[PDB]
Structure formats: C-alpha cells, structure tokens
Structure 1
Amino acid sequence: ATQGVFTLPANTRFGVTAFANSSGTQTVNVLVNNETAATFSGQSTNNAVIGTQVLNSGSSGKVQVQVSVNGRPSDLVSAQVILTNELNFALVGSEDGTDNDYNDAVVVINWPLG
C-alpha cells in the first residue's frame, strides 16, 4: 500500500521534523501538492534532528514524504493518529538496509500549530 502520503486540512500550517538513525546519509524530501517544499539531510546513529520546518499544506492539503540514501529510495511505513479528536500526528519510518529497524530516517508531521 502507498505509504508516506497524508491528506492534511487545507491551507493549514504543519510542522515536519526528521531524525536520523543510520550509518547512511539520509535525504528527506517533503512534497506539498506534488512539489518539493522542504529537504533535510544528515548522518547520525543517535537520533539527530536533521531538520525541522513549518510548512503550509496549501489548497489541496496533500503532503508526501520521501526518503533516499545514496540516491536509492528507502522503503517507507506510515500512519496518522488523532488524539482527543483534534491533535494530529502523521508518522513515517524508513529502511535503507537489511535490518528492518525502519528508523533510518524517522519523520513526524504535527498539526495544528499555534
């Protein structure tokens, strides 16, 4: 099934934050309405926050996360969780190798902000 694609409230600010846990340098791309809106990169095996940014979901609300290492797309896993019918987290894990820890780049999207 498609992973890393989320429908957010239209025209709404959201936070996107990426963490690295791999020997490989991670590159995380965030697409809003199918166009790159943010790119983060780094290399850590200790959960470095390689990027954090506030974006707007735009007219369509479509947000997609992609992750690659050495130009090869990582396999993604994702889900969205809503607390007290209001607080939202869109979650992404990714795997760049063979151990299946899926933490090589971890991405958290949160809204609402403010």
Structure 2
Amino acid sequence: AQQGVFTLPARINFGVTVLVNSAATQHVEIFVDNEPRAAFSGVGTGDNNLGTKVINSGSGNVRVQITANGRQSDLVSSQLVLANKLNLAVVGSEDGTDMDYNDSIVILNWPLG
C-alpha cells in the first residue's frame, strides 16, 4: 500500500515534527496538494529533533517524502485519534539495511491552538 499519505481536514493548520536516528543525512519534504510546503534536513543517531513547522492542509491531500543518499526511503505510516479529538499521523522510514524504521520519524498533529 502507499504509505506516508494522509487525508486531513480541509484548510487546517497542522504541525510537522521530525526526529532522526541515522548516520545518513535525512531530507524530509511535506507536499500539500502535490506541491512542496515544508522541508527539513539533518543527521544524527540520538533521536535528534529537527524542529516543528506549521503548514496548511489545502484540500486535505498531504504526503510525506523522505530521502537519504539520493533515494526515497521505505515508509510505514498510521493515523491515530485520541479522545475523539487529537489526531497524530506518524511516518517511520528506513534508509538502509537494518530495518529499524527510525531513520526519520515524521509526526503530523492537529488541531492546534
């Protein structure tokens, strides 16, 4: 199945947070309606936090893309709703051979405020 693709509520602001656990530099792009809207990059094996950016969901079509060594990483993803209110969309990724799926971890959350 496709992974890293989520349908958000339309026209909502959401946060994107990235953690890295890799020796290879990670490059994360968030697409909204097939257009690039947020970029992150970094490297480190200590759950290193690349920060959070807030962007708008447009029609709702959000895709997470993660590249390392020039290749798009293998993605795994899920969406969780807590208390019928807090939404988290999570992406793990694998850039190599050890199948740890933590090389970049991308977390989307909404609503904010």
Q: TM-score range by the shorter chain?
A: over 0.9
Provide the residue aligned with 2:38 in structure 1.
Answer: 38
Shift of 1:52: 1.3
Distance 1:111 1:43 in 2: 26
The answer to which structure has the higher strand fraction is: 2
**1:102 lines up with 2:101 in the alignment:** yes
> Tell me, which stretches of 5 or more residues in structure 2 are unaligned?
none
Shift of 1:85: 1.0
Distance 1:74 1:112 in 2: 28
Aligned length: 113
Shift of 1:39: 0.8
Distance 1:57 1:17 in 2: 15
Q: What is the aligned-residue identity percentage?
A: 61
Provide the residue aligned with 1:63 in structure 2.
Answer: 62
Provide the residue aligned with 1:51 in structure 2.
Answer: 51
Distance 1:51 1:34 in 2: 23
TM-score w.r.t. structure 2 length? 0.98
TM-score w.r.t. structure 1 length? 0.97
What does the per-residue CA deviation read over 1:34-80, in whole Å, with 9 as the maximum and x for residues that have no partner? 1000110001100111231000101x111100101021110000000
**1:78 lines up with 2:72 in the alignment:** no
Q: Which amino acid aligns with 1:105?
A: S
Q: Which runs of 4+ in 1 moved over 4 A?
A: none
